[PDB]
Ligand binder design. Structure first.
Ligand code: A1ILX
Length: 147
């Protein structure tokens, strides 16, 4: 469901921005996802250090355009798997870091619009596959939770 995925995307951005929501904290699924997607994010950032400077993420519309282009490329072969889904979260982490630095008239609520378009992409493009492969709780978590 959209709301569940939106919460994962918002939790991940709040984790990257070092502002986890005060309170009882993220779910077990969200905690597992943060760990595994951050490992991906850091390696992507290291490998792509040169080209990450080729954009200036001045607005949320710039971030959405980059997101659409990168994800159309990422899924061009039609293969959906958990690795690619994790990479979506790693990529929104890179985008939010660039927006924090580069957004004109920064808006501390920006991570909520990025979470929305991330959830929209995941739902509409990978949602069926996710359900058929166990959902987050019987698919993703079972595969990636600590040994
Ligand atoms: C030098 C690249 C470049 O100019 N840009 C770019 C392109 C793609 C990016 O990220 C995608 C998402 C992470 C990485 N994909 C994978 O690692 N996928 C493997 C194979 C499938 S898997 O098993 O799931 C893992 C490539 C980035 Cl971060 C950057 C630009 C288009 C660019 C530059 C800066 C920003 Cl902020 C956005 C885009």
């Amino acid at each position: 469901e959209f709301g569940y995925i939106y919460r994962l995307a918002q939790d991940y951005l709040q984790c990257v921005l070092q502002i986890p929501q005060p309170g009882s904290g993220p779910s077990k699924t969200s905690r597992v996802l943060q760990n595994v997607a951050f490992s991906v994010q850091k390696e992507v950032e290291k490998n792509l250090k040169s080209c990450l400077d080729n954009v200036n993420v001045v607005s949320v519309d710039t971030a959405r355009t980059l997101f659409n282009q990168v994800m159309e490329k990422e899924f061009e072969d039609g293969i959906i798997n958990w690795g690619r889904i994790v990479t979506i979260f790693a990529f929104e982490g890179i985008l939010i870091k660039k927006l924090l630095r580069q957004q004109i008239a920064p808006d501390v609520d920006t991570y909520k619009e990025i979470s929305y378009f991330v959830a929209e992409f995941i739902m509409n493009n990978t949602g069926e596959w996710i359900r058929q492969n166990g959902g987050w709780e019987n698919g993703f978590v079972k595969k990636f939770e600590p040994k």
